[PDB]
């Protein structure tokens, strides 16, 4: 319910190991973003927001209007991404209050 207020778009089944990765996602009208929100790349099966492989702060949309639908993009750098390690990962959007408000389908780096 609350777990799908952020929607990750066009997530692939796999990404090339240590290649730059654009992460696209949408804020639905149900979330009011915050400058301390962030997107993490989590190994599938994580237990806490602390278990991320890497992360980026989510840039606060400029001229934000409450209740709107907003598209966002983050450029994860290859040198902070997993190698071909046999694991599956997913994007998770985490608010400044610690809530997970969206989680993508999983992907492997290979």
């Amino acid at each position: 319910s609350n777990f799908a207020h952020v929607i990750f778009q066009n997530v692939a089944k796999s990404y090339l190991p240590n290649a730059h990765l654009e992460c696209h996602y949408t804020l639905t009208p149900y979330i009011h973003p915050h400058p301390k929100d962030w997107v993490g790349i989590f190994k599938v099966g994580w237990s806490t927001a602390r278990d991320y492989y890497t992360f980026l702060w989510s840039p606060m949309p400029e001229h934000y209007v409450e209740g709107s639908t907003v598209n966002c993009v983050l450029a994860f750098q290859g040198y902070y991404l997993p190698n071909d390690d046999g694991e599956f990962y997913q994007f998770c959007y985490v608010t400044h209050k610690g809530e997970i408000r969206g989680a993508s389908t999983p992907f492997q780096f290979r």
């Binding site: 777990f3 089944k13 989590f42 599938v44 099966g45 994580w46 237990s47 806490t48 927001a49 599956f88 997913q90 998770c92 610690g98 809530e99 997970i100 989680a103 389908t105 999983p106």
Partner: protein, 43 residues
């Protein structure tokens, strides 16, 4: 947060379950194509 962790894992599991089924179906087709190609060479 404990609930979010369980939800995110079910979501990942469901996608990997679908991808396994797609993979097994391809596995069956590729194996039939090989049997056909090997059979072509014996004649």
């Amino acid at each position: 947060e404990s609930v979010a962790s369980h939800f995110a894992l079910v979501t990942a599991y469901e996608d990997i379950k679908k991808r396994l089924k797609d993979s097994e179906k391809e596995n069956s087709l590729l194996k039939k194509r090989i049997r056909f190609l090997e059979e072509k060479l014996i004649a």
